[PDB]
Structure formats: C-alpha cells, structure tokens
C-alpha cells in the first residue's frame, strides 16, 4: 500500500541525477575547497546553487557529484563508527522509586545530576 504513493513522486527522484553523490571529507577552505575522497583522491570544488557559504566547515563530510564534482548537501561528521549507535538505550525499566532506603546514596546523586538538568537556574 505505501509503495504506490511513493512511486508517483519517484519520477524526479530516480530518473534525474541528484542522489548519486560521492561523499568525502573537506580539508582546506579558501574564501577553492580541497577535499579527499574515500579512494584517496584530492580535488578542488566550490559552493553550489542552494549551498550556503557558512554551512561548509573544516573536517566535515560533504557529498559531491561523481561526474562533475560540486558541493550539493552537507552531512554530519563522524559517519564511520557504527558502534555507538547501539550504545544509546531508551526508557529503562527501572524507575526512580525502585531504589529502596532513605539513606544518603539517593539524594546526593540527584542534586549533582538531576538538579542542574531540571533547574539550571537554581
């Protein structure tokens, strides 16, 4: 069912050449941009049509076209590691009231952690 609606807009996003971009990390910024590919190939490029001059930063993955190299869209850096994506959990089962006892191992932790996050202006 969802595949039928995506085939209508798939004319401009497939037949035309946009997505086939070669992603690489930028090195030098001259305001000429020296960028090294994943195949260890250095070249020179410049901004695009909708590309902003303040978006390009040093040490950032920047996708460029494979035929005629030009900056198209910026990408967040550090794309190589896949390990830390699984290190983030969501909604732990243990609640705050699961810790028993009135002793000082509770209140001391919430004041140095939960207090500055909930009330930073205190």
């Amino acid at each position: 069912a969802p595949s039928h609606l995506w085939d209508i807009m798939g004319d401009r996003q497939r037949l035309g050449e946009e997505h086939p971009l070669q992603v690489a990390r930028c090195t030098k910024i001259i305001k000429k941009y020296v960028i090294n590919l994943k195949q260890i190939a250095k070249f020179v490029v410049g901004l695009g049509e909708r590309v902003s001059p303040t978006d390009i930063e040093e040490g950032m993955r920047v996708g460029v076209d494979r035929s005629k190299y030009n900056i198209e869209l910026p990408l967040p850096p550090r794309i190589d590691p896949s390990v830390t994506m699984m290190t983030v959990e969501e909604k732990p089962d243990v609640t705050y009231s699961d810790v028993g006892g009135c002793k000082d191992q509770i209140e001391k932790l919430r004041e140095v952690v939960e207090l500055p996050l909930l009330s930073p202006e205190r």
């Binding site: 020296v34 190939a41 070249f43 020179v44 490029v45 005629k68």
Partner: protein, 45 residues
C-alpha cells in the same frame, strides 16, 4: 623630427590593439578554468 615622434606614438596604439587580444585570451583562460580539477603530486621538475 616629427617622424621619430610619430612611430613612438603609434607604438602605444599598436600595443593597445594587441592588448585586447591578450585580454581576450585571458578570458578564454578564465573560461578554461573551472573549479572541478584534480590534485597531483609533483615527481620531478
């Protein structure tokens, strides 16, 4: 006297005519220079 000064006066005019050809060649060079080039390592000069 006027002959010696006429050749030097036309010399600057002939240089300006050839200068337009140099400016047109520089425009062709600037047209031949487009950002996507490649970087190579110099071996021997």
């Amino acid at each position: 006297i006027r002959i010696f000064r006429s050749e030097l006066q036309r010399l600057s005019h002939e240089n300006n005519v050839m200068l337009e050809k140099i400016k047109d060649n520089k425009e062709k060079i600037k047209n031949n220079r487009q950002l996507p080039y490649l970087v190579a390592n110099v071996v021997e000069v």
